[PDB]
């Protein structure tokens, strides 16, 4: 197969010019075609053959190929054009192949550190010998964070899930994360917390079976 | 023109799925359409195609042997058969017209298929009561775990749909057990909290369940 | 008369195989035939059944869904065809002629159809020396591992053949690993330790591969 | 479905007479049919409907059903009749059912001690992460055994797999089993342990990565 390079992320304010680079082996030879994919719905044809635009699709996306590199160009960037970018190309050798796709965030709005909630476990899934905790990050951006659980300080491996960042109505994000266990292990300790990392910065909640 | 695809479809490992796509006009005249596919977070990776008007159809190295992209009589719909089903062909599938020169202008909705070994399950819902203390002086956040159903989705209201300033309703997780997991939470004024009931409305179609939790002060 | 069924099969999970039943005089007549399947060590377990000369067939609640018994157009044929193999179809498979109060007179030799996640691996061969002490003070005991080989089966012999008496060659193991293992052993006079050059000879066609192991004393 | 229960084992010495029994629900009500299988060979339909010998079965088998109970019987005990018996019925509600089956031992033979051998690992598998003992257990009648290792004296759960005694040229029975761990284990223990147990009685072997 062949293989299509892309950056996994792209940043740009508002107005601002954004460029998604694409690369691969003599790329140049090759027709490229950009698809636009927003949450939820399908991809969208926006530049194909190199620099062709289709009906429907604004000036504002250029395309451009040439060498080992091809490069979808979005001027004057509207939060609009917020959406994961994929390159592609037609390799008699790979068929259809795909780049790894980049998201584009159209940083319109400043930094919000995100607020932390975690609720122990509700008594009544202990009925079911269960016992999980909850830890609801919201209003952060950008969307990206991480997050760590510790049981009594230290790290904790087993039982975690996590969901990756989504808008919230306000165009804000937030996430949730999950420590699984049983009511033994829930009672057995003097505490829990769930730690937020954000932007450099860190955020963490702790609850006590004793509280 | 336009390409429709089929509904969701849940299936068991081992088993197999067959996907539709119909063109929108009655035919596909002399188009090839292809078979995309998308992993959840996942890209876009190619599957095969097919061209209706010559009865030919190509294939991906990667699927060759467990797909199988057919038509019917009036070459109005183009169908993808993938066999063996895995926990990795969880995915979702498109279909798409493609380009002289290489590329795909349309696409269809796609079509969602999880691929699991559970079997259909209605949700435990707990409550996330606010804590003795208070949240954020003013302030107060409650909400509801809707844990282990089995498929999605769920949907979540607050109050019957009174309550919907404050409210956020969380993704899904997907956990070791294949079951599925998630939580709605609303912001509502600390002093709420003792004089005004908080419910939320669970309702799981696919298991004809309904749960309206009650959630109150720890 | 008798009834020929076709060779073992070997498949990965998910697949599908499909076994042969041909009688004997040309055709099944107006004979009922069954298949009945057999896991190691386990009983025997009837699958279904079909009459070529009706065109009709029966099946088990268990595999209602997964199997089809079919025959071929001179129903001098009838076939089995199991899907979505699990680790747990691994059995022999038999065919066998329904009487008319309800036994089966006529039996296949069988066929064997494992179902593995394993590719075909040729075997490593360890030695079991002898101890520096010696076994049963007279005669000793030394032999080979054949560890790790997928699928069955391997022979094993002794210096060409030659070595016959005080010979055992153990049946195979199926570790988790998915892998094969076994054993051979030969009692020889302790004297003949040291100055007796002692190989056993493994074979493993289903690799092209043959290990002459040497096994010295420790 | 419906149930056949047979004894699971039925010892019998040459000469004498074998009864294998079968029970299940009005079972007297069906039509009764035994098959004889031995090792590596398909079923052999030996008496159906109830009583009939097909041709070429001796007539020493006989068979009889009433109750909720199907006999199977072998007069005059042969070598020849050592084998597994299934008796099956056909039931409109299940098909066709067979009993759990019953092993004939033909006790023509004195009871024989198990000889166990216990080869330690050959350095040559360390080359492969690997460091296997094998266990031999041989010259032994009737054909049941248990074995257990042990590792400086306590039992061992994990890495244990051991083969069903089967025939070995002399009419006796041979068993194997092999103990799977990393050559690190195998060399950091004093010594490791094989305990067969037969007709009662316990053979055990040990070997020390010293020795």
Known sequence: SYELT???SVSVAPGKTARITCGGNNIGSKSVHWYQQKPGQAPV?????????????????????????????????????????????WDSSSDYVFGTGTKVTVLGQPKANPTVTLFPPSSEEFQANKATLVCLISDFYPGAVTVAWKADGSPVKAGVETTKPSKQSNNKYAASSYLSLTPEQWKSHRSYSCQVTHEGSTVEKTVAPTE | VQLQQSGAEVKKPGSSVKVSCKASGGTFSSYTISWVRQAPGQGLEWMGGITPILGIANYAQKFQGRVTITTDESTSTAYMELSSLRSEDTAVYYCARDTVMGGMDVWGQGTTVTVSSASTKGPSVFPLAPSSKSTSGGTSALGCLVKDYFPEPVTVSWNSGALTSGVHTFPAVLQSSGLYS???????????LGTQTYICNVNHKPSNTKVDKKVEPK
Chains 1, 4 share one sequence.
């Open chain 1, 6 to 8: 892309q950056p996994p």
């Open chain 1, 45 to 89: 044809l926006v530049v194909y053959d190199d620099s062709d635009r289709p009906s429907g699709i604004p000036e504002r996306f250029s395309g451009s190929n040439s060498g080992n590199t091809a490069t979808l160009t979005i001027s004057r960037v509207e939060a609009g054009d917020e959406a994961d970018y994929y390159c592609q190309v």
């Open chain 2, 182 to 192: 998630l939580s709605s939470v609303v912001t509502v004024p600390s002093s709420s």
